[PDB]
Amino acid sequence: VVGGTEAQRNSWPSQISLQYRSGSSWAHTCGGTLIRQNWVMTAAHCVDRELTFRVVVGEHNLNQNNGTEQYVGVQKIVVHPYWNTDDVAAGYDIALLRLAQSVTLNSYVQLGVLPRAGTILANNSPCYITGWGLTRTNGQLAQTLQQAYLPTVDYAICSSSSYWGSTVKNSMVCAGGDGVRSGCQGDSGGPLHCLVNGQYAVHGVTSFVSRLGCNVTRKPTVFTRVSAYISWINNVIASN
């Protein structure tokens, strides 16, 4: 997250860290949202590489023991069947991870609330992106979980020529684009939390930023619109 602030430890209990085995250790690669005690929602592009993955729930500082983490392997990966790694702009950037063990819920570990199917937010709706992604374009991951206020940019504006044009689809949510705050590499897969009727709900799965940089004016961070995939998500969890 560029232009973020450190999140309080219990603000976003559904945020997870998706990591891959790196020799003797594990490295953060993407965020995710815990949606069942044994299921995580993340971006399909986060699991394009054939790596060994684990999920960390109750994480706050990637480089220190927080005394709250639970570590679980990934037992199954279900990517949306229409995902294509060479066309992120086509959409379908979503995947569900079945965990090897069910995690235990507490103030640091909770299920993310998902919007009702079809819900579309009005332009400029209040949302926060969270994650450990780079803190600057071409920078380094954050140590502590970061959050940034990114108001939505509706489809008509976001798909306009000076913003993202045809690259943005109605199955995506755009948020931010102020040139200061944004998602960045490593935030992909995590949640976009938006306040609707007094409750934060995960409306987006972080998907992409401009190739020009993370925080680019009129290139808001782009997320898979969760409310477009409620049936798909329920079908996968019921069939697995």
Ligand SMILES: *C(=O)[C@@H](CC)[C@@H](CNS(=O)(=O)c1ccc([N+](=O)[O-])cc1)C(=O)O
């Ligand atoms: C996500 O982090 C976005 C920026 C919000 C970037 C791409 N995702 S990534 O850099 O985390 C990533 C993760 C995993 C793979 N892979 O497994 O192939 C690839 C990229 C972005 O849009 O640059």
Ligand SMILES: [Ca+2]
């Ligand atoms: Ca930690």
